[PDB]
């Protein structure tokens, strides 16, 4: 029937309906007059439902009539969504008029069953030395770009999009969750100017939007990717920051009447994360390959949110603030990054031995650093002096000029193949470049460009 607003507190709104017409959990409601949508989150009792606004409440009042829609938020899906920018409710947020949808799906859904999961190890080349070496991605696998503030999550993702999405023959979904509106504009003009906007669906929910918008934007983008997967297609799903989904739940949790847990987080942190993460998967019909950027509060990887996220991913790439503070990009930690593909049966024994060889040298250098600081470098053995020189060369050979980062560096971008990466690191470990200075390996590309740089 019809309901009346009874209590507005921030982004949370209570609506009272006849005790015989109480709307369902996750049901969408519409306010009369005002253009605002409310999703039922809890049934308090006595015909009252607790809901979160999908817009602003500055114009809302007590007593406004609310209408029950009989269903959850229904967004447009299929071919009509390609080359379009949309909000959480699926409305077009571009001036290109309406979208010719032929079907609408509900953002809430069950995860694929245990019998529907599919296993594949097809190696996906990225063109980045550190990743292709220690974090080899797989087609249909889940990748996570973990890092704090200002270390390269967006930049690295843009480079991957460029080295994969542009070549990818299938479709793609890009979801900007709690992102800067300036990054969304630069990326839209970039996809449009590159002529690739035709095969990319764009959903944006930036930081200027109400908590409810940032809490459901991820389900909207995923619902569009699930329609394409279920058609038997191969899809790419890029999420700008999945942390903003957890944070929107923390911002609203206390007003929903929930007691706080450790580090002031919602008591439903692990279930709210599992309900989203289990839908982003490759079933037996089609394959979703996904890259998610994961913000790390205060650079602490032990924080409950980052700590609960690792178990949901196949490839974990870790970006370090201490490496970025030395002017080294990509700022990937080769000792904290890992992949399920880093196995001799999947990548081969030569690649695996080269990756483990690089990690052994870097771990040994990490423990010799303090010795060198207090006593000095002459008090080391001849084997240690040689190992420290090679560790410093490997640490600089992992830096790479990127095409999406030329405005920040002024230097042209480079794409290194997996064959070239293995050869360059195997050579440094063996000793084929113990005469070149460590500065020759900083920001170059393949090992030949280090040889040319050394002369100059």
């Amino acid at each position: 029937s019809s309901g009346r607003i009874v209590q507005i507190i921030g982004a949370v709104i209570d609506v009272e309906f006849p005790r015989d017409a109480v709307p369902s959990i996750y049901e969408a409601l519409k306010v009369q007059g005002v253009e605002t949508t409310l999703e039922v989150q809890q049934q308090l009792g006595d015909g009252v439902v607790r809901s979160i606004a999908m817009g602003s409440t500055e114009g809302l009042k007590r007593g406004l009539n609310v209408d029950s829609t009989g269903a959850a938020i229904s967004v447009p899906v299929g071919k009509a969504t390609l080359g379009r920018i949309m909000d959480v409710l699926g409305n077009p947020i571009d001036e290109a008029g309406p979208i010719g949808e032929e079907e609408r799906w509900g953002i809430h859904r069950e995860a694929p069953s245990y019998a529907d999961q599919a296993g594949g190890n097809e190696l996906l080349e990225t063109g980045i030395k550190v990743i292709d070496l220690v974090c080899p991605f797989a087609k249909g696998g889940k990748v996570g770009l973990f890092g704090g503030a200002g270390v390269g999550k967006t930049v690295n993702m843009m480079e991957l999009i460029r080295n994969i999405a542009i070549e990818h023959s299938g479709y793609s979904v890009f979801a900007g969750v709690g992102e800067r509106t300036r990054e969304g504009n630069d990326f839209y003009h970039e996809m449009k100017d590159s002529n690739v906007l035709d095969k990319v669906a764009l959903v944006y929910g930036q930081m200027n939007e109400p908590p409810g918008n940032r809490l459901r934007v991820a389900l909207t983008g995923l619902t569009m990717a699930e329609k394409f997967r279920d058609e038997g297609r191969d899809v790419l799903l890029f999420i700008d920051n999945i942390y903003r989904y957890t944070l929107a739940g923390t911002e609203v949790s206390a007003l929903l009447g929930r007691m706080p847990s450790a580090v002031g987080y919602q008591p439903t942190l692990a279930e709210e994360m599992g309900v989203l993460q289990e839908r982003i998967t490759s079933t037996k019909k089609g394959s979703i390959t996904s890259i998610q950027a994961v913000y790390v509060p205060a650079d602490d990887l032990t924080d409950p949110s980052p700590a609960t996220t690792f178990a949901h991913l196949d490839a974990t790439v870790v970006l370090s603030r201490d490496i970025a503070s030395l002017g080294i990009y990509p700022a990937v930690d080769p000792l904290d990054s890992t992949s399920r593909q880093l196995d001799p049966l999947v990548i081969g024994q030569d690649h695996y031995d080269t990756a483990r060889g690089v990690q052994y040298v870097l771990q040994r250098y990490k423990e010799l650093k303090d010795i060198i600081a207090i006593l000095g470098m002459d008090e080391l053995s001849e084997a240690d002096k040689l190992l420290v020189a090679r560790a410093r060369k490997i640490q600089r050979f992992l830096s790479q000029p990127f095409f999406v980062a030329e405005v920040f560096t002024g230097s042209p971008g480079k794409y290194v193949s997996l064959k070239d990466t293995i050869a360059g690191f195997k050579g440094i470990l063996n000793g084929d470049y113990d005469h070149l200075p460590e500065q020759a390996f900083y920001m170059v590309g393949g090992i030949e460009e280090a040889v040319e740089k050394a002369k100059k």
Partner: protein
């Protein structure tokens, strides 16, 4: 070809009579907790029946309402819906029919291989056998790892914790311990709590690729499933493991993340508004893990003859547990890790610094301990593990002198290389479990000085080639050692002659 008409014949033999039921009405629904009005005779732990074949459990029997948790999906339930007492506690199917099957926390098959044919059911929550019905742990449980089986031995009925940070081999060590039981006689149970569905499928695919699945029960409660199912899964798996122990047999159970079970129990508690403590956990989080882990035990012949009512005689049954816990940046002082470290019989600590230094099994033998010790070892491994302990201890004391090996005193330099060769021997590969005879060759060779002329970098190829040689020319001696892990002067002389002959030609 035709089956629908015959299965319907049975449906016409089912009760159609009225039954007295005790009911209530749903008052509120939120975050997986349905509050009910009525149910005056519901018991603490009883299962409530809702419309649609959805079931719940009563946990907060307050004066004016019942707080119930859904054992499934709660987003279809609503205010005014009917709720009914069942008169029953939660029970799961039990027996040999579960071996080689994947099931949910309630015992329903999820693998798609068809219905389970279990001949009995049992209660998920039960008390552990009392003090007087137990027997001391003195039988081994081989894990196939030289570092664990030689220095941190696990016995039948013991509880050994696998503790360490993320991504360092915790799961690999427990899965390999299950794979090694395919020929031993120990039935195995693996419980997955809060894992993603594709990860559980890679472990089952590896249990099948190694021939271990037909001897294992897999209980799953994945990350998208209700916190009540994740909280109950360890108790359901324990109940399935207790069948074999109470009937005179032996079983092994792995709880892949007790820390995720604690997180699920914290969610339910804070949503029922129970008073919080340290790290926001409820006041009975110690009792949660202790009630579970004290069931893993060894029971005497008199308990098995009493339970079997005489059918099984002369046999002592057991349930061995390998709980797994994740630490944050090596902090073992956190609330949940502190509780479980104090409940268990021993701990295997895995370290990130050792794992990044190429020491793949990552077992820190300097802090890892088994309180059962030598009682959980065969005679041959108990005799060859004593010197391995002394050599690693000496290596931990003399590890800074490697950069000054020239300047060292000869005695100390002899000890240093022995320590470095025994340290390189502990390194092993995944999915490669070793038998008592094969482990004995490697431990014997190092402990009796047969590695002093092998470069620390060739110790591994020497081990691999030595085992391959004995598998061809000494198959009868390996079979003899594998009977009971026995040791005597003929076996000692036999192994020595084979190692001397190996070096003299291979």
């Amino acid at each position: 070809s035709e089956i629908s008409e015959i299965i319907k014949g049975r449906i016409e033999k089912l009760d159609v009579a009225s039954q007295a039921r005790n009911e209530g009405t749903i008052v509120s629904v939120s975050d997986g907790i349905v509050r009910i009005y009525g149910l005056a005779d519901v018991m603490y732990g009883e299962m409530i029946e809702f419309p649609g074949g959805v079931y719940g459990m009563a946990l907060n029997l307050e004066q004016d309402s019942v707080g119930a948790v859904v054992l499934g999906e709660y987003q279809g339930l609503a205010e005014g819906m009917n709720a009914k007492c069942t008169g029953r506690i939660l029970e799961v199917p039990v027996g040999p029919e579960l071996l080689g099957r994947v099931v949910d926390a309630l015992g329903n098959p999820i693998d798609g291989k068809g219905p389970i044919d279990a001949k009995a059911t049992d209660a998920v929550e039960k008390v552990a056998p009392g003090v007087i019905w137990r027997k001391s742990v003195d039988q081994p449980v081989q894990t196939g790892y030289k570092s664990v089986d030689a220095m941190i031995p696990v016995g039948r009925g013991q509880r050994e914790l696998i503790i360490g940070d993320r991504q360092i081999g915790k799961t690999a060590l427990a899965v390999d311990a299950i794979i090694n039981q395919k020929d031993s006689g120990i039935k195995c149970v693996y419980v997955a709590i809060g894992q993603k569905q594709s990860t559980i499928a890679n472990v089952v695919r590896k249990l099948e690729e190694n021939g271990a699945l037909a001897n294992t029960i897999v209980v799953a409660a994945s990350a998208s499933e209700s916190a009540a199912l994740q909280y109950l899964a360890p108790y359901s798996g324990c109940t399935m493991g207790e069948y074999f122990r109470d009937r005179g047999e032996d079983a092994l159970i792995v709880y892949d993340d007790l820390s995720k079970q604690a997180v699920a129990y914290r969610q339910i508690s804070l949503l029922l508004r129970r008073p919080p403590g340290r790290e926001a956990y409820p006041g009975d989080v110690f009792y949660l893990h202790s009630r579970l882990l004290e069931r893993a035990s060894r029971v005497s012949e008199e308990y098995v003859e009493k339970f079997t009512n005489g059918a099984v005689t002369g046999k002592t049954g057991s349930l061995t547990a390998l709980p797994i816990i994740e630490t944050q940046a090596g902090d073992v002082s956190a609330f949940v890790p502190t509780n479980v470290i104090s409940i268990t019989d021993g701990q295997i600590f895995l370290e990130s610094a050792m794992f990044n230094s190429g020491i793949r099994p990552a077992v820190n033998a300097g802090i890892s301990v088994s309180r059962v010790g030598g009682a959980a070892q065969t005679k041959i491994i108990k005799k060859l593990s004593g010197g391995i302990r002394t050599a690693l201890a000496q290596y931990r004391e003399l590890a800074a002198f490697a950069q000054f090996a020239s300047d060292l005193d000869e005695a100390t330099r002899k000890q240093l290389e022995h320590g470095q060769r025994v340290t390189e021997l502990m390194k092993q590969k995944q999915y490669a479990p070793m038998s008592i005879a094969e482990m004995s060759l490697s431990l014997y060779a190092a402990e009796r000085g047969f590695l002093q002329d092998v470069e620390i970098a060739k110790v591994g190829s020497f081990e691999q080639a030595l085992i391959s040689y004995f598998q061809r020319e000494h198959a009868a001696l390996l079979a003899k050692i594998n009977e009971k892990g026995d040791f005597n002067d003929e076996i000692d002389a036999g192994i020595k002659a084979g190692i001397e002959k190996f070096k003299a030609t291979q």
